[PDB]
């Protein structure tokens, strides 16, 4: 109940309290006769008679409500920190149940000490939280959480995000071609601002679409991080199970002694530790069958060469079916160049609008959304197969290239040029890395020659 009455960051405290309870049960079992700690834990979690326990349901609830729309990712530190201004407070969590200190860590002093110890994890989510979640959710919790996350992503992409994209497409310029380098960086910036002026004045872009984009990016980032944690846990388990599965390391070999003989001698020395063969030699038929099944389960894990992000990416791509994402066929029959009927142009417009240096009394994009917005946009672009087109066709990239070529700095419409191009440089550095990562996870048309007349 205490775990259910707090946010997701209380998972470490819950794990510590569960460890304390397990230690108490072990101590008491010396004289008394109680059920196994697993049975009591499952009865309390209601997982005995249900596929999913209370812990996994609460984790999913928190992920849906408080985690995704409030935490902004930071790739440099691989940590999550809460948004400077919350855009969601309707969580309405339960009331903390009071109880005697004994039911808690054991005493007032012990409770205070443990609260102080676990108070450092309250304001961030990181590898420790992910590994604790994996340990507590086994495989069922991860599977159900990822299924619900996929459902939420499908609902968001085909719902509010789709309507906002459709609305923004109409206001976008009918045709927009990158200006030549002769005009110069200031004229090009002025032209881009005039062409995209209507997008800038739009207010809901930075409060709903951006928010939705942040929600879809945090979900995918959580999926990626959870998988890595699971893989690490599996590798540790595999390392522990080597002695009982006849798995040995590469033993040192010296001149005069052959590797094969040394390995054979080492295996012979560890022969008693082997379980399966030993059980077969001295075991009942039922025991042997159970042992074989257990060994098989122990040796087969997802870390043995099974990937899981590719399926999620394919499902997200399949969720994109509206023609607005790709638009009509090109007039020239090869690709769109001038027309802005593709989502990549809209993403470029978003980058241009939120790359403008904001004042001192307002938050920036990173402060509120962090890297979730960029991750979501890059994922969408990659799944739409327009990363190369986006890189070639982009207002910010062309403006930065022209600024570098000419090297000018002017205050064009209350917008510094050098700071804007530096921000564009940083953002494209981030976008390139994100796109490269996405492409690394996921991995013709012939024309006719002219005919004489």
């Amino acid at each position: 109940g205490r775990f259910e009455s707090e946010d997701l960051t209380s998972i470490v405290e819950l794990d510590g309290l569960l460890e304390i309870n397990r230690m108490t049960h072990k101590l008491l079992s010396r004289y008394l006769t109680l059920d196994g700690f697993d049975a009591m834990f499952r009865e309390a979690n209601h997982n005995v008679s249900a596929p999913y326990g209370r812990i996994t349901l609460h984790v999913f609830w928190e992920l849906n409500y408080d985690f995704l729309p409030n935490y902004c990712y930071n790739g440099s530190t691989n940590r999550f920190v809460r948004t400077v201004l919350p855009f969601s407070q309707e969580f309405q969590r339960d009331k903390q149940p009071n109880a005697q200190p004994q039911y808690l860590h054991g005493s007032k002093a012990l409770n205070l000490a443990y609260s102080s110890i676990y108070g450092s994890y309250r304001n961030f989510v990181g590898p420790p939280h992910f590994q604790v979640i994996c340990r507590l959710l086994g495989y069922q919790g991860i599977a159900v959480v990822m299924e619900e996350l996929l459902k939420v992503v499908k609902s968001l992409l085909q719902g509010t995000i789709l309507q906002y994209v459709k609305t923004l497409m109409e206001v976008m310029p009918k045709i927009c071609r990158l200006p030549r380098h002769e005009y110069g960086s200031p004229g090009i910036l002025e032209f881009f601002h005039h062409q995209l002026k209507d997008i800038v004045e739009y207010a809901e872009l930075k409060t709903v679409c951006f928010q939705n984009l942040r929600e879809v990016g945090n979900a995918i980032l959580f999926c990626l991080l959870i998988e890595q944690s699971l893989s690490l846990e599996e590798v540790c388990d595999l390392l522990h199970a080597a002695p009982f599965q006849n798995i040995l390391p590469r033993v040192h070999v010296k001149e005069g002694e052959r590797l094969d003989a040394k390995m054979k001698r080492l295996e012979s020395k560890y022969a008693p530790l082997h379980l399966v063969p030993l059980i077969e030699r001295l075991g009942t038929p039922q025991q042997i069958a159970i042992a074989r099944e257990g060994d098989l389960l122990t040796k087969e894990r997802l870390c043995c060469g099974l990937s899981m992000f590719e399926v999620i990416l394919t499902r997200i791509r399949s969720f994109l079916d509206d023609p607005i994402w790709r638009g009509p066929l090109p007039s020239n029959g090869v690709m769109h160049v001038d027309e802005c009927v593709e989502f990549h142009r809209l993403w470029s417009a978003m980058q241009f609008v939120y790359c403008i240096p904001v004042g001192t009394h307002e938050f920036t994009v990173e402060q509120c959304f962090g890297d979730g917005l960029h991750w979501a946009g890059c994922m969408i672009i990659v799944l739409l197969g327009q990363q190369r087109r986006f890189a070639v066709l982009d207002f910010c990239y062309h403006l930065l290239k022209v600024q570098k070529h000419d090297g000018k700095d002017e205050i064009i419409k209350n917008v510094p040029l050098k700071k804007m191009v530096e921000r564009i440089r940083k953002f494209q550095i981030l976008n390139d890395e994100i796109i490269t990562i996405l492409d690394k996870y996921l991995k013709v048309r012939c024309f006719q020659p002219p005919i004489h007349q």
């Binding site: 999913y52 349901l57 609460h58 999913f60 609830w61 849906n64 159900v144 619900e148 459902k151 939420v152």
Partner: peptide
């Protein structure tokens, strides 16, 4: 999602 209904 529907599991949200169930937990509610």
């Amino acid at each position: 999602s529907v599991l949200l209904e169930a937990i509610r």
